[PDB]
Design an enzyme around this catalytic site. Structure first.
Site, PDB file in Angstrom:
ATOM      1  N   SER B  49      -7.942 -26.574 -53.841  1.00 29.37           N
ATOM      2  CA  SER B  49      -8.201 -26.594 -52.375  1.00 29.37           C
ATOM      3  C   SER B  49      -8.563 -27.937 -51.826  1.00 29.37           C
ATOM      4  CB  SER B  49      -9.293 -25.589 -52.291  1.00 29.37           C
ATOM      5  OG  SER B  49      -8.634 -24.171 -52.533  1.00 29.37           O
ATOM      6  N   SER B  97     -11.464 -22.195 -47.482  1.00 29.20           N
ATOM      7  CA  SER B  97     -10.287 -22.414 -48.397  1.00 29.20           C
ATOM      8  C   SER B  97      -9.192 -21.235 -48.202  1.00 29.20           C
ATOM      9  CB  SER B  97     -11.005 -22.473 -49.793  1.00 29.20           C
ATOM     10  OG  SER B  97     -12.039 -23.226 -49.861  1.00 29.20           O
ATOM     11  N   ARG B 232     -20.787 -27.919 -59.161  1.00 34.13           N
ATOM     12  CA  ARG B 232     -19.800 -28.923 -58.620  1.00 34.13           C
ATOM     13  C   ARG B 232     -20.344 -29.629 -57.345  1.00 34.13           C
ATOM     14  NH1 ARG B 232     -15.420 -25.086 -55.551  1.00 34.13           N
ATOM     15  NH2 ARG B 232     -16.904 -24.156 -54.158  1.00 34.13           N
TER      16      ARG B 232
HETATM   17  C1  LIG Z   1      -9.320 -23.605 -53.555  1.00 30.30           C
HETATM   18  O1  LIG Z   1      -9.795 -24.074 -54.668  1.00 30.30           O
HETATM   19  C2  LIG Z   1      -8.689 -21.932 -53.745  1.00 30.30           C
HETATM   20  N1  LIG Z   1      -8.792 -21.586 -55.191  1.00 30.30           N
HETATM   21  C3  LIG Z   1      -7.865 -20.798 -55.825  1.00 30.30           C
HETATM   22  O2  LIG Z   1      -6.950 -20.355 -54.975  1.00 30.30           O
HETATM   23  C4  LIG Z   1      -7.757 -20.689 -57.256  1.00 30.30           C
HETATM   24  N2  LIG Z   1      -6.473 -20.411 -57.591  1.00 30.30           N
HETATM   25  C5  LIG Z   1      -8.816 -19.465 -57.651  1.00 30.30           C
HETATM   26  C6  LIG Z   1      -9.694 -19.666 -58.563  1.00 30.30           C
HETATM   27  C7  LIG Z   1     -10.497 -18.511 -59.033  1.00 30.30           C
HETATM   28  C8  LIG Z   1     -10.352 -17.550 -58.313  1.00 30.30           C
HETATM   29  C9  LIG Z   1      -9.503 -17.335 -57.014  1.00 30.30           C
HETATM   30  C10 LIG Z   1      -8.754 -18.272 -56.843  1.00 30.30           C
HETATM   31  C11 LIG Z   1      -9.945 -21.358 -52.981  1.00 30.30           C
HETATM   32  N3  LIG Z   1     -11.146 -22.001 -53.494  1.00 30.30           N
HETATM   33  C12 LIG Z   1     -11.765 -20.897 -54.341  1.00 30.30           C
HETATM   34  C13 LIG Z   1     -13.369 -21.148 -54.528  1.00 30.30           C
HETATM   35  O3  LIG Z   1     -13.739 -22.114 -53.882  1.00 30.30           O
HETATM   36  O4  LIG Z   1     -14.255 -20.591 -55.214  1.00 30.30           O
HETATM   37  C14 LIG Z   1     -11.532 -19.668 -53.967  1.00 30.30           C
HETATM   38  C15 LIG Z   1     -11.660 -18.605 -55.219  1.00 30.30           C
HETATM   39  C16 LIG Z   1     -12.592 -19.097 -52.961  1.00 30.30           C
HETATM   40  S1  LIG Z   1      -9.948 -19.766 -53.484  1.00 30.30           S
END
Ligand SMILES: *C(=O)[C@@H](NC(=O)[C@H](N)c1ccccc1)[C@@H]1N[C@@H](C(=O)O)C(C)(C)S1
Ligand SMILES: *C(=O)[C@@H](NC(=O)[C@H](N)c1ccccc1)[C@@H]1N[C@@H](C(=O)O)C(C)(C)S1
Lengths: 244, 246
Positions: B49, B97, B232
């Site tokens: 993100s 995000s 983080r």
């Molecule tokens: C950016 O970092 C986004 N993350 C994702 O899309 C990952 N693929 C993901 C990981 C784990 C669970 C779902 C998606 C968004 N940022 C994340 C966060 O900050 O926790 C999110 C899960 C909200 S999606």
């Protein structure tokens, strides 16, 4: 159009404060207030003036850019927090009068008059000295006029580059949460007397979700110890409306 | 930046939390940087993100995003997270995000243009293979903590190959904490938990403007358990506190 909200009065009665709060959703078409008369009554802007002063500084190239540093010469200033180098935001955030005073001298009466006329900024009266008309002169502006002015800045619709408007808007951020952003500016003219009190301000807007709210507050003040009410009374009102 | 120096003292907060990761902190006036671990500082990871930042700049610049007052309307069809099921402003999409929002933006930007702008931005390995709408989330794109701070410095200085107005738009969208003496701009990222053997990554990158100084930062860490995600922020924050920055 301005409408009176009776319930907002409780907050002033509590603290025995005479003042007004004006609040507008989406735009300055429909505003709500605790007092119709006092909403359109004009007062000295004091440091809320930093906002047009900064825009005009940028526009005229007196302020070179976003990143310019206002150097301290080392000569005494009226507050210790002004005795240091300042960026634009730093100077706005601590109301560094000497910095805005030198910006105003450089702008000069003629350009200053032209811009406040362009901005419809209050009574547009800059007489009383180029480096003090907003502090002790004859310039006056109402809560309603403040909200209109900040609304135009929010929309990049002031007569100034979008770039210079964005720079000032960022310098004005005072609170950031995931759910919302606050830009705001305080002002305090002084204590005056009991028979003729100074005025205290808090003005700005809140961006929340897809909605925006413009606010402006002032109150009579004859004792510096009352100063926190300029933030706490309108914060209460906005907290109770679910805006913050 | 002009120089980087290892300070292994910063490994304190990492050991305390049983965490492997890196923090990179640079002072803009001196052009000099410090890190707890030079090696990991140079290692490249999925932006996840954090990629919202160039994505939003490219969106503005190609005109795919009209301006900061653009509203990204929710259709109503259920999305992967509840906080995404609402209308959103640019800032709103950045702040939570909102993946599907930036996927749509990427799709409209397209491969050729996306490729072009990552080249202009010197963004990581510039590798957008894997589908124009997921290369930053599950694809071949990788970037390091050092590259991230260089890219941020450019944004801050309005030096990216984009209009100053579009950079300002994104800079404001990034504000996450305000105080009289300092302003923080930042963005989180989290690729997913991967595995104990192949952990995912979490990021916190940004900059802090305090007095007349600006400090740029980039944090990343391996993560194999969502319970560790608040680290983080808490670890880099403790470090900037100890350095008197926030
Ligand atoms: C950016 O970092 C986004 N993350 C994702 O899309 C990952 N693929 C993901 C990981 C784990 C669970 C779902 C998606 C968004 N940022 C994340 C966060 O900050 O926790 C999110 C899960 C909200 S999606
Ligand atoms: C703007 O409102 C500035 N106020 C003044 O210049 C008054 N002449 C003044 C009042 C009290 C003390 C010193 C000057 C700045 N606003 C004040 C505030 O917001 O509390 C200030 C003390 C920071 S000076």
């Amino acid at each position: 159009s301005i409408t009176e909200n009776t319930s907002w009065n409780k907050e002033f009665s509590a603290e025995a404060v005479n003042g007004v709060f004006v609040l507008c959703k989406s735009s300055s078409k429909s505003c709500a207030t605790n007092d119709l008369a006092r909403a359109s009554k004009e007062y000295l802007p004091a440091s809320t003036f930093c906002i047009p002063n900064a825009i005009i500084g940028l526009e005229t190239g007196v302020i070179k850019n976003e990143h310019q540093v206002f150097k301290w010469d080392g000569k005494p200033r009226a507050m210790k927090q002004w005795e240091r180098d300042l960026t634009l935001r730093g100077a706005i955030q601590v109301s560094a009068v000497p910095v805005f005073q030198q910006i105003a001298r450089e702008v000069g009466e003629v350009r200053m008059q032209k811009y406040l006329k362009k901005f419809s900024y209050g009574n547009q009266n800059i007489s009383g000295g180029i480096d003090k008309f907003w502090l002790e002169g004859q310039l006056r502006i109402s809560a309603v006029n403040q909200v209109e002015f900040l609304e135009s800045l929010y929309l990049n619709k002031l007569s100034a580059s979008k770039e210079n408007q964005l720079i000032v808007k960022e310098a004005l951020v005072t609170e950031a949460a995931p759910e919302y952003l606050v830009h705001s500016k305080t002002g305090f003219s002084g204590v005056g007397t009991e028979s003729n009190p100074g005025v205290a301000w808090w003005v700005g807007w809140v961006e929340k979700e897809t909605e925006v709210y413009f606010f402006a507050f002032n109150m009579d003040i004859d004792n510096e110890s009352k100063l926190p009410l300029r933030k706490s009374i309108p914060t209460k009102i906005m907290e109770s409306e679910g805006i913050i």
